[PDB]
Design a protein around this nucleic acid. Structure first.
Ligand SMILES: [K+]
Ligand SMILES: [K+]
Ligand SMILES: [K+]
Ligand SMILES: [Mg+2]
Ligand SMILES: [Mg+2]
Ligand SMILES: [Mg+2]
Ligand SMILES: [Mg+2]
Ligand SMILES: [Mg+2]
Ligand SMILES: [Mg+2]
Ligand SMILES: [Mg+2]
Ligand SMILES: [Mg+2]
Ligand SMILES: [Mg+2]
Ligand SMILES: [Mg+2]
Ligand SMILES: [Mg+2]
Ligand SMILES: [Mg+2]
Ligand SMILES: [Mg+2]
Ligand SMILES: [Mg+2]
Ligand SMILES: [Mg+2]
Ligand SMILES: [Mg+2]
Ligand SMILES: [Mg+2]
Ligand SMILES: [Mg+2]
Ligand SMILES: [Mg+2]
Ligand SMILES: [Mg+2]
Ligand SMILES: [Mg+2]
Ligand SMILES: [Mg+2]
Ligand SMILES: [Mg+2]
Ligand SMILES: [Mg+2]
Ligand SMILES: [Mg+2]
Ligand SMILES: [Mg+2]
Ligand SMILES: [Mg+2]
Ligand SMILES: [Mg+2]
Ligand SMILES: [Mg+2]
Ligand SMILES: [Mg+2]
Ligand SMILES: [Mg+2]
Ligand SMILES: [Mg+2]
Ligand SMILES: [Mg+2]
Ligand SMILES: [Mg+2]
Ligand SMILES: [Mg+2]
Ligand SMILES: [Mg+2]
Ligand SMILES: [Mg+2]
Ligand SMILES: [Mg+2]
Ligand SMILES: [Mg+2]
Ligand SMILES: [Mg+2]
Ligand SMILES: [Mg+2]
Ligand SMILES: [Mg+2]
Ligand SMILES: [Mg+2]
Ligand SMILES: [Mg+2]
Ligand SMILES: [Mg+2]
Ligand SMILES: [Mg+2]
Ligand SMILES: [Mg+2]
Ligand SMILES: [Mg+2]
Ligand SMILES: [Mg+2]
Ligand SMILES: [Mg+2]
Ligand SMILES: [Mg+2]
Ligand SMILES: [Mg+2]
Ligand SMILES: [Mg+2]
Ligand SMILES: [Mg+2]
Ligand SMILES: [Mg+2]
Ligand SMILES: [Mg+2]
Ligand SMILES: [Mg+2]
Ligand SMILES: [Mg+2]
Ligand SMILES: [Mg+2]
Ligand SMILES: [Mg+2]
Ligand SMILES: [Mg+2]
Ligand SMILES: [Mg+2]
Ligand SMILES: [Mg+2]
Ligand SMILES: [Mg+2]
Ligand SMILES: [Mg+2]
Ligand SMILES: [Mg+2]
Ligand code: NA
Ligand code: NA
Ligand code: NA
Lengths: 102, 122, 76, 50, 48, 111, 52
RNA sequence: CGGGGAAACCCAGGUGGAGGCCUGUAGCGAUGCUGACGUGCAAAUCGCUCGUAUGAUUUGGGUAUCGGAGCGAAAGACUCA
RNA sequence: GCAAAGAUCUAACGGAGAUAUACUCAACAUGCAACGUUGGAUACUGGAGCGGGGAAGGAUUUCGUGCCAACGGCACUCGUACACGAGUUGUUCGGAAACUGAGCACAACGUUAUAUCGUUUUGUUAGGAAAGUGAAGGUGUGUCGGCGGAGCUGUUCGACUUGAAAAGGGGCAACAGAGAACCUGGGAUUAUAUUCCAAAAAGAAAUUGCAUGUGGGA
RNA sequence: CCCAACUGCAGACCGUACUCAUCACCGCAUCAGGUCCCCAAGCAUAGAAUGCUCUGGUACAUAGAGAAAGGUACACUCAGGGAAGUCGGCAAAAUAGAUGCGUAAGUUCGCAAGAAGCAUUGGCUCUGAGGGCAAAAAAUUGCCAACUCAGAACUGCUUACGGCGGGGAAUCCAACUGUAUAAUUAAAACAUAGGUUUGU
RNA sequence: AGUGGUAAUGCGCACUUGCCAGGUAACAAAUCAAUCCUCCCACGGUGAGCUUUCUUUUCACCAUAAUCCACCUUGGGCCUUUUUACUUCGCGUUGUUCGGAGCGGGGGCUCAAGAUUGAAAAAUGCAGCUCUUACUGUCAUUGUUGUGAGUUCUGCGCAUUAAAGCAAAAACCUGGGGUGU
């Protein structure tokens, strides 16, 4: 029994290294629509899930009370925070205000 | 993955390090040594071949003390604290035999964990 | 297949009239006593080798004892 | 296909057993008029459709 | 078929597998019990 | 060497009752095995809401036939037919409605 | 094929020990769990069946 | 969810994924070349082009309606060339 | 004319199919062209495949050996050709036994000069007496129980001999709906295999129908 | 007599080869037509588009030699002009992906619309942004995976695989999606929602 | 002549087709998670390919069937407790929600999908090889990761546009009564 003929992934693996570094993916290389390559629903689902996970962790750690959690939960659903860092910075602003009021 | 790779870093690729070191590989060349092809001068550049060709952290030749190569008891012993594949010294062996036109004569085979022995095609 | 837990009920399995044979399996870490009954293959797992030797002698001489080996294709 | 009634299978069996050449000794009989089987059948020429 | 084998040949059949051949005849694969030897009864039958 | 499979029984249609799962054998063969149909499980009456009953399994035909009785019911009255809240409602209803009848009957008889 | 809703009304058998479960065209406002009265002495209420 | 407004309500972002909706495979059709072929591969086919492609959608098996009768989103269409 | 679907080359082996010759003549200029197999080479199909399995349809085309008159629109040493001889193995797979559906139409009744006509699932034949099945009892038998003096009375449950209640005859129609207790290994074939394997069943199970004994109730 | 775990014995009938098609079925035939179901790899790419490839399959469809004319093509190109051709722009050419900006009349306010139009796109070496888990202003300390987008410097083009809308101004007809003369007519014909009338 | 737990319900508790009532069989979009498997990585073993020069490299393989035993992850239903849970509220989804007709929190009961331990089961399978022929023996290997990409098994219905609302029956299951009494 002879061995199977070789089908090699060496070129693909080398090209994968270049693409991981940011090559071969510019404007001239794109054939599908932007939503086809990266659906906006998938991006929204990831972002909202990140924001909801962070708020739950902050509530469980008692960094925020349930009233602040509920206010931020509705605002996360309302497209107020662009990413995780935007939400954390806003929580710091709320916490700083509460300290001054205290 | 977590950190984006740079092209300049290909000059120095990090090689893995064992926690509890002293991993030993053995090349058993007893069968062909009795036939004289592995002569005194052949054994000279044989271990020399394994000296400057064995790569470390990507670089080649600078073995330092991380990899120790020794010759005694008619068998070749490679000891290193670094993390190496056993196939690598089978691939280095095949490179040597091709350089000396012996690949059609001597086949390297696995006998146990960490041991490679050199026999003849029957 | 059914696993026998204790040695007391293992001797009851071999004492049954339908126990055709006992297959003794020698694993590197344990010894298995597989009793071929009518409906089920009952197995007792003994880890200690000294106990396994004692148990093997305690097997009733009515039940045939089979030493499990790797029978070859040429043999079979 | 796999399915067929046993009665259909038996009809096909008889057609298989009839699809034979004439025995040689038949042609040597005293008043023989048979030289070859005139009812020979081939599965590609004529269909039975059972 | 099992009962006929007992009457005709005084052997015990542990399994009978049957098929109807494409020519219309029925063929039986009869395994005899390990007590009986199929070669021995084949010699007695006359097929050897 | 990417493997492809065939139907191993004599039904070659992808219906709800002929679902298949890929199975890797000890001989390194990829074969197709039929999935067993599942029962929805024991429910409360459709007119009452048609909800799965607590303490009862979802067994199909022969598995339900061979299973022990308490796998399919509870020790409470109407166990395996009505839920706990439905049983409580009937007990309360039986007592209260029968009490109203006696009071109404006693008033009529006394007058 | 029918615009009007249908109602399944459970009655007791007047002579046997069993239920009947008749099916009629539902008037507007009929609901599940409603008690339906049919007969000479039925009160005048929506869903009840009375002699004209 | 922001921003306005006395109120009525209005203006902005996001989410969502509707439609006998669109581009476009398979599928189902057949517009033009009045192309090929036109004693053909074919008693209707071939090539490119083209319609539609979640719907009044396509399709297997089974079943029901026929000869002055049947069936027909209707062309006297179809009912084994 | 035998031009869609890209394509074959090479050596060796096999074969009658050759390196086939009056003179002259070293070979060319006088035996051409074509076959099958194997190894190399090259290419195509490109997973909606000239892949691997089934239904309908076909019914031996399957397999081995032999063979080349006709046939495979050229060719064949090849063949789905011809001849001979073989091959299809099931408690669990599909069907039936054994479901209902769109439906059919036996009986019954009616009609027709004429049944070769009509009705026959909107729970359902027929002006229509279409149930032969049987709660409970009474009466015997068998397996028990309790009482008092192996038997007696009474009693439980299965076998044998008085009659509650069960309206609406008998059937077909699905190999893709419902239903359905098996699944791996094999050095097991020329051809069949969840179908063959035999005591270490390669083996491991799951399910019916009867029984026996044990344990426990009667 | 009835339950539990066993155990003993017995598990009847028919189908089962092969094919399912550019040769096994229908089409007079090994006919480029037709014929239901299941499993379905890698890369490019939005991808069951299209192109190429490992596995499996195949080299079977009469061949050889070989620049006549004239043909057919799921083959091209052509200076200058650019529809003057022709019944008629038939045919061919042309447009072309993605991204940013931008887009008229008309309108049942839904559209028209990809209207029309401009611009960018390669390769390299970088830089930012977009996360997870664990550890007692944890607003930090560690470890780590998958990718996408954006912005720079340098360096290029012969504008260079496949695939992939030409556009605009108007008239006539039918509202629209659909159907429909199998084999010369796909339309303005039929249907349609909407409207009206009749019998009961 | 059943039995435990406040309860959700637990336990191996006899007969029932005289009769009656329910259930299974039994059907249903899209979105989002996604099973067995498939494909990719990462690491590591075994064999092979390339090897004038490079290539800690390229390719292949690294398998565990039914049937059983024992019993932490997600999703749903429910119980108990605290309910001074909604006055210019809180919990949750990507998503259209939900709550005194009982939200959230603590502690539980249960169902559905899967982990996991073990019997089966290495005695099998796969690859290379020692010895020396017999289709012989000896021996070596015999894997795990992945917030990776697919995948309709499943979560999933009183479940879709709807003047569209999506078969039935056999067979089986449980109960109500009754028998045992
Ligand atoms: K089949
Ligand atoms: K009739
Ligand atoms: K029409
Ligand atoms: Mg959106
Ligand atoms: Mg077929
Ligand atoms: Mg037929
Ligand atoms: Mg059979
Ligand atoms: Mg369910
Ligand atoms: Mg229960
Ligand atoms: Mg859409
Ligand atoms: Mg459309
Ligand atoms: Mg369209
Ligand atoms: Mg269009
Ligand atoms: Mg088709
Ligand atoms: Mg023409
Ligand atoms: Mg011509
Ligand atoms: Mg199309
Ligand atoms: Mg007629
Ligand atoms: Mg006309
Ligand atoms: Mg000619
Ligand atoms: Mg021609
Ligand atoms: Mg050709
Ligand atoms: Mg060749
Ligand atoms: Mg010559
Ligand atoms: Mg010649
Ligand atoms: Mg190709
Ligand atoms: Mg091609
Ligand atoms: Mg593919
Ligand atoms: Mg194919
Ligand atoms: Mg053949
Ligand atoms: Mg010929
Ligand atoms: Mg023949
Ligand atoms: Mg023959
Ligand atoms: Mg009628
Ligand atoms: Mg019917
Ligand atoms: Mg009837
Ligand atoms: Mg009647
Ligand atoms: Mg039937
Ligand atoms: Mg069929
Ligand atoms: Mg079926
Ligand atoms: Mg079956
Ligand atoms: Mg075969
Ligand atoms: Mg077969
Ligand atoms: Mg077969
Ligand atoms: Mg096929
Ligand atoms: Mg034919
Ligand atoms: Mg014909
Ligand atoms: Mg394609
Ligand atoms: Mg593709
Ligand atoms: Mg290939
Ligand atoms: Mg052909
Ligand atoms: Mg050819
Ligand atoms: Mg031809
Ligand atoms: Mg020419
Ligand atoms: Mg002009
Ligand atoms: Mg002119
Ligand atoms: Mg003119
Ligand atoms: Mg044109
Ligand atoms: Mg405007
Ligand atoms: Mg005008
Ligand atoms: Mg129109
Ligand atoms: Mg349309
Ligand atoms: Mg149209
Ligand atoms: Mg029509
Ligand atoms: Mg026409
Ligand atoms: Mg036309
Ligand atoms: Mg009109
Ligand atoms: Mg009008
Ligand atoms: Mg349901
Ligand atoms: Na005929
Ligand atoms: Na020609
Ligand atoms: Na054809």
């Amino acid at each position: 029994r002879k061995p199977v003929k070789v089908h090699s992934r060496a070129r693909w693996r080398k090209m994968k290294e270049a693409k991981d570094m940011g090559r071969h993916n510019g404007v001239g290389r794109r054939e599908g629509s932007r939503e086809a390559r990266m659906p906006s629903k998938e991006l929204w689902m990831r972002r909202l899930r990140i924001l909801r996970r962070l708020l739950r962790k902050y509530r469980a750690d008692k960094k925020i009370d349930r009233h602040v959690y509920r206010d931020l939960y509705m605002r996360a659903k309302g497209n107020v925070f662009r990413n995780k860092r935007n939400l954390v910075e806003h929580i710091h602003k709320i916490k700083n205000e509460k300290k001054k009021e205290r | 993955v977590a950190v984006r790779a740079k092209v300049g870093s290909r000059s120095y690729v990090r090689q893995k390090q064992l926690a509890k070191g002293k991993k030993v590989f053995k090349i058993d060349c007893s069968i062909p040594a009795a036939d004289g092809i592995f002569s005194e001068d052949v054994l000279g550049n044989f271990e020399q071949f394994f000296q400057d060709n064995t790569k470390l952290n990507g670089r080649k030749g600078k073995l330092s003390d991380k990899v120790r190569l020794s010759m005694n008891d008619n068998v070749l012993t490679i000891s290193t604290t670094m993390a190496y594949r056993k196939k690598y010294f089978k691939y280095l062996t095949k490179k040597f035999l091709k350089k000396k036109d012996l690949r059609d004569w001597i086949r390297i085979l696995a006998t146990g964990k960490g041991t490679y022995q050199l026999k003849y095609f029957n | 297949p059914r696993e026998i837990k204790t040695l007391k009920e293992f001797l009851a399995i071999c004492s049954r009239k339908d126990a055709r044979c006992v297959k003794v399996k020698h694993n590197p870490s344990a010894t298995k006593f597989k009793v071929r009954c009518s409906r089920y293959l009952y197995t007792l797992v003994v880890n200690d080798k000294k106990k396994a030797d004692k148990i093997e002698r305690s097997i009733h001489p009515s039940v045939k004892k089979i030493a499990v080996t790797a029978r070859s294709h040429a043999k079979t | 296909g796999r399915f067929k009634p046993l009665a259909v299978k038996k009809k096909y069996a008889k057609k298989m057993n009839q699809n034979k050449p004439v025995p040689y000794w038949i042609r040597l009989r005293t008043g023989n008029r048979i030289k070859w089987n005139e009812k020979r059948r081939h599965w590609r020429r004529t269909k039975l459709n059972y | 078929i099992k009962k006929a084998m007992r009457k005709l040949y005084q052997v015990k059949a542990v399994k009978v597998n049957t098929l109807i051949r494409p020519d219309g005849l029925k063929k039986a694969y009869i395994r005899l019990s390990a007590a009986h030897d199929a070669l021995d009864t084949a010699n007695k039958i006359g097929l050897v | 060497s990417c493997p492809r499979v065939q139907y191993r029984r004599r039904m070659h249609y992808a219906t709800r009752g002929n679902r298949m799962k890929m199975v890797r054998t000890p001989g390194n063969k990829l074969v197709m095995q039929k999935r067993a149909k599942r029962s929805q499980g024991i429910h409360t009456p459709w007119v009452l809401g048609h909800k799965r009953l607590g303490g009862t399994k979802a067994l199909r035909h022969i598995d339900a036939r061979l299973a022990s009785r308490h796998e399919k019911s509870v020790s409470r009255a109407y166990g395996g037919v009505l839920s706990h809240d439905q049983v409580r409602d009937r007990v309360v209803r039986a007592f209260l409605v029968e009490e109203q009848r006696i009071v109404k009957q006693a008033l009529k008889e006394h007058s | 094929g029918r615009g009007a809703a249908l109602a399944r009304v459970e009655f007791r058998h007047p002579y046997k020990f069993r239920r009947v479960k008749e099916l009629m065209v539902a008037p507007e406002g009929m609901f599940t769990g409603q008690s339906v009265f049919c007969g000479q002495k039925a009160p005048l209420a929506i869903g009840n069946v009375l002699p004209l």
